[PDB]
Design an enzyme around this catalytic site. Structure first.
Site, mmCIF file in Angstrom:
data_model
loop_
_atom_site.group_PDB
_atom_site.id
_atom_site.type_symbol
_atom_site.label_atom_id
_atom_site.label_comp_id
_atom_site.label_asym_id
_atom_site.label_seq_id
_atom_site.Cartn_x
_atom_site.Cartn_y
_atom_site.Cartn_z
ATOM 1 N N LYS A 175 0.806 -3.054 9.006
ATOM 2 C CA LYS A 175 2.072 -2.294 9.071
ATOM 3 C C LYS A 175 3.171 -3.327 9.420
ATOM 4 O O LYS A 175 2.957 -4.132 10.373
ATOM 5 C CB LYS A 175 2.032 -1.306 10.226
ATOM 6 C CG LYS A 175 0.943 -0.218 10.186
ATOM 7 C CD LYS A 175 1.514 0.921 11.033
ATOM 8 C CE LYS A 175 0.443 1.893 11.535
ATOM 9 N NZ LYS A 175 -0.272 2.597 10.381
ATOM 10 N N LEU A 199 0.809 -1.232 0.000
ATOM 11 C CA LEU A 199 0.000 0.000 0.000
ATOM 12 C C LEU A 199 0.824 1.255 0.000
ATOM 13 O O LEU A 199 0.336 2.296 -0.506
ATOM 14 C CB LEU A 199 -0.942 0.047 1.205
ATOM 15 C CG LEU A 199 -2.006 -1.075 1.124
ATOM 16 C CD1 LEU A 199 -2.827 -1.034 2.427
ATOM 17 C CD2 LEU A 199 -2.933 -0.864 -0.077
ATOM 18 N N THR A 230 -4.976 -3.870 10.956
ATOM 19 C CA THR A 230 -6.207 -3.099 11.098
ATOM 20 C C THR A 230 -7.207 -3.436 9.989
ATOM 21 O O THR A 230 -6.847 -4.072 8.972
ATOM 22 C CB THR A 230 -5.935 -1.559 10.971
ATOM 23 O OG1 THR A 230 -5.452 -1.291 9.655
ATOM 24 C CG2 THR A 230 -4.955 -1.108 12.024
ATOM 25 N N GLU A 231 -8.414 -2.928 10.156
ATOM 26 C CA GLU A 231 -9.407 -2.927 9.110
ATOM 27 C C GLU A 231 -8.767 -2.220 7.911
ATOM 28 O O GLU A 231 -7.949 -1.302 8.082
ATOM 29 C CB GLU A 231 -10.592 -2.158 9.708
ATOM 30 C CG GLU A 231 -11.184 -1.038 8.972
ATOM 31 C CD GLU A 231 -12.310 -0.320 9.679
ATOM 32 O OE1 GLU A 231 -13.396 -0.214 9.079
ATOM 33 O OE2 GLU A 231 -12.180 0.188 10.795
ATOM 34 N N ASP A 260 -1.658 13.854 16.399
ATOM 35 C CA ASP A 260 -1.300 14.135 15.035
ATOM 36 C C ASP A 260 -2.523 14.075 14.148
ATOM 37 O O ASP A 260 -2.531 13.438 13.099
ATOM 38 C CB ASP A 260 -0.194 13.203 14.534
ATOM 39 C CG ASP A 260 0.574 13.766 13.344
ATOM 40 O OD1 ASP A 260 0.190 14.804 12.744
ATOM 41 O OD2 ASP A 260 1.577 13.084 12.919
ATOM 42 N N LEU A 313 -0.198 6.884 18.233
ATOM 43 C CA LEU A 313 1.067 6.201 17.858
ATOM 44 C C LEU A 313 2.256 7.138 17.821
ATOM 45 O O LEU A 313 3.427 6.657 17.780
ATOM 46 C CB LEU A 313 0.927 5.504 16.485
ATOM 47 C CG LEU A 313 -0.043 4.306 16.565
ATOM 48 C CD1 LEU A 313 0.046 3.539 15.235
ATOM 49 C CD2 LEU A 313 0.251 3.357 17.724
ATOM 50 N N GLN A 344 5.651 6.378 8.438
ATOM 51 C CA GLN A 344 6.678 6.619 9.480
ATOM 52 C C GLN A 344 7.323 5.331 10.007
ATOM 53 O O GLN A 344 8.481 5.349 10.375
ATOM 54 C CB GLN A 344 6.058 7.403 10.649
ATOM 55 C CG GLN A 344 7.114 7.958 11.653
ATOM 56 C CD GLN A 344 8.177 8.834 11.023
ATOM 57 O OE1 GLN A 344 7.879 9.671 10.167
ATOM 58 N NE2 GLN A 344 9.426 8.716 11.514
HETATM 59 C C1 LIG Z 1 -6.945 6.645 -5.583
HETATM 60 N N1 LIG Z 1 -7.145 5.195 -5.220
HETATM 61 C C2 LIG Z 1 -7.528 4.862 -3.828
HETATM 62 C C3 LIG Z 1 -6.336 4.662 -2.922
HETATM 63 N N2 LIG Z 1 -5.148 4.045 -3.547
HETATM 64 C C4 LIG Z 1 -4.251 3.348 -2.840
HETATM 65 O O1 LIG Z 1 -3.262 2.941 -3.367
HETATM 66 C C5 LIG Z 1 -4.430 2.967 -1.391
HETATM 67 C C6 LIG Z 1 -5.610 2.290 -0.979
HETATM 68 C C7 LIG Z 1 -5.794 1.952 0.371
HETATM 69 C C8 LIG Z 1 -4.822 2.312 1.327
HETATM 70 N N3 LIG Z 1 -5.129 1.979 2.621
HETATM 71 C C9 LIG Z 1 -4.369 2.093 3.776
HETATM 72 N N4 LIG Z 1 -3.148 2.665 3.764
HETATM 73 C C10 LIG Z 1 -2.417 2.730 4.960
HETATM 74 C C11 LIG Z 1 -1.110 3.389 4.927
HETATM 75 C C12 LIG Z 1 -0.343 3.297 3.771
HETATM 76 C C13 LIG Z 1 0.885 3.965 3.716
HETATM 77 C C14 LIG Z 1 1.396 4.705 4.809
HETATM 78 C C15 LIG Z 1 0.609 4.760 5.966
HETATM 79 N N5 LIG Z 1 0.990 5.510 7.068
HETATM 80 C C16 LIG Z 1 1.361 4.967 8.244
HETATM 81 O O2 LIG Z 1 1.440 3.738 8.434
HETATM 82 C C17 LIG Z 1 1.616 5.909 9.389
HETATM 83 C C18 LIG Z 1 1.013 7.196 9.400
HETATM 84 C C19 LIG Z 1 1.209 8.094 10.484
HETATM 85 C C20 LIG Z 1 1.980 7.684 11.593
HETATM 86 C C21 LIG Z 1 2.269 8.611 12.748
HETATM 87 C C22 LIG Z 1 2.814 7.896 13.970
HETATM 88 C C23 LIG Z 1 3.338 9.640 12.308
HETATM 89 C C24 LIG Z 1 1.026 9.416 13.127
HETATM 90 C C25 LIG Z 1 2.570 6.402 11.562
HETATM 91 C C26 LIG Z 1 2.340 5.531 10.478
HETATM 92 C C27 LIG Z 1 -0.637 4.096 6.047
HETATM 93 C C28 LIG Z 1 -2.979 2.304 6.139
HETATM 94 N N6 LIG Z 1 -4.251 1.720 6.141
HETATM 95 C C29 LIG Z 1 -5.023 1.207 7.152
HETATM 96 C C30 LIG Z 1 -6.187 0.750 6.572
HETATM 97 N N7 LIG Z 1 -6.137 1.023 5.218
HETATM 98 C C31 LIG Z 1 -4.939 1.625 4.951
HETATM 99 C C32 LIG Z 1 -3.668 2.982 0.951
HETATM 100 C C33 LIG Z 1 -3.456 3.324 -0.404
HETATM 101 C C34 LIG Z 1 -4.832 4.352 -4.972
HETATM 102 C C35 LIG Z 1 -6.101 4.324 -5.789
#
Ligand SMILES: CN1CCN(C(=O)c2ccc(Nc3nc(-c4cccc(NC(=O)c5ccc(C(C)(C)C)cc5)c4)cn4ccnc34)cc2)CC1
EC number: 2.7.10.2
Length: 263
Positions: free
Chosen positions: A35, A13, A79-80, A126, A147, A17
């Site tokens: 993650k 995906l 997670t979901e 955040d 987190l 961080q």
């Molecule tokens: C336009 N379309 C729709 C979306 N798309 C995608 O590629 C796409 C689709 C679904 C996605 N879903 C998720 N993406 C993530 C995700 C992906 C990349 C990075 C992260 N970020 C993190 O893991 C993260 C963020 C913040 C923090 C602190 C501690 C700084 C606050 C720590 C960690 C999350 C988490 N999820 C939890 C449940 N679902 C998702 C992510 C990307 C492309 C096509």
């Protein structure tokens, strides 16, 4: 504690961080995000203990934690799955051609989650559109609450670091490290501004330093074109110079529902 035998990894995906995040299946049935916590990115033992408390946070508008895998490295957080990804990128796609009722509904989704966290005396620290996610039905949920406490990257955790969320922080956080329910309220007002601006960067013509200086002097974000005077009053109420004069999430939720009914 999830057994990793019950997880299948299917797609990457993106990277956040704590490193890589994958899409996969849990128990051959349920869509999940997982993650994979990169070595050196997280204060792991402190997280593992808090995860037990975080399993108790459950609300329709919070990303649901399903479990963790901690008897191995890297640790996994399961997670979901939120199929439409990050709210910030979603707001920036012009094809959605959102009505303003849909924008207020996104603000209500977040306010509901935050009213729940507030009732549990649990700070996000955040809150911002980049830390909210959107599911397959367009519902917004708040992600990664709490987190920030386990991040080992001084550029993120230091008020003067390049990754600190300066533009979502009240003056008392930037000047004194005064974190409270009211710093999440401030950040929520900035998030409503992001939503009604269709994902503009707050203080889009200023640096982080200049923003800190602008707000210390009592000036605030301007009304986005799509925000009515009523919607603007709700986001602006989150930015009172005196923390104790800012509303609670229960009050903001009442205000949002009143605007929905009026407008
Ligand atoms: C336009 N379309 C729709 C979306 N798309 C995608 O590629 C796409 C689709 C679904 C996605 N879903 C998720 N993406 C993530 C995700 C992906 C990349 C990075 C992260 N970020 C993190 O893991 C993260 C963020 C913040 C923090 C602190 C501690 C700084 C606050 C720590 C960690 C999350 C988490 N999820 C939890 C449940 N679902 C998702 C992510 C990307 C492309 C096509």
């Amino acid at each position: 504690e999830i057994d990793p035998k019950d997880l299948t990894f299917l797609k990457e995906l993106g990277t956040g961080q704590f490193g890589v995040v994958k899409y996969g299946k849990w128990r051959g049935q349920y869509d999940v995000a997982i993650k994979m916590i990169k070595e050196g990115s997280m204060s792991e033992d402190e997280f593992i203990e808090e995860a037990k408390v975080m399993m108790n946070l459950s609300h329709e508008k919070l990303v649901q934690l399903y479990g963790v895998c901690t008897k191995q490295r890297p640790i996994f957080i399961i997670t979901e799955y939120m199929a439409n990804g990050c709210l910030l990128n979603y707001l920036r796609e012009a094809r959605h051609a959102f009505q303003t009722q849909q924008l207020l509904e996104m603000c209500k989704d977040v306010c509901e989650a935050m009213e729940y966290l507030e009732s549990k005396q649990f700070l996000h620290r955040d809150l911002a559109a980049r830390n909210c996610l959107v599911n397959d039905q367009g519902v917004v949920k708040v992600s990664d609450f709490g987190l920030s406490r386990y991040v080992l990257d001084d550029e993120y955790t230091s008020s003067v670091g390049s990754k600190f969320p300066v533009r979502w922080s009240p003056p008392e956080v930037l000047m004194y490290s005064k974190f409270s329910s009211k710093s999440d309220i401030w950040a929520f007002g900035v998030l409503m501004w992001e939503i009604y601006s269709l994902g503009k960067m707050p203080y889009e013509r200023f640096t982080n330093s200049e923003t800190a200086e602008h707000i210390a002097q009592g000036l605030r974000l301007y009304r986005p074109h799509l925000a009515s005077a009523a919607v603007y009053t709700i986001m602006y109420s989150c930015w009172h110079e005196k923390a104790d004069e800012r509303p609670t999430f229960k009050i903001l939720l009442s205000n949002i529902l009143d605007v929905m009914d009026e407008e």
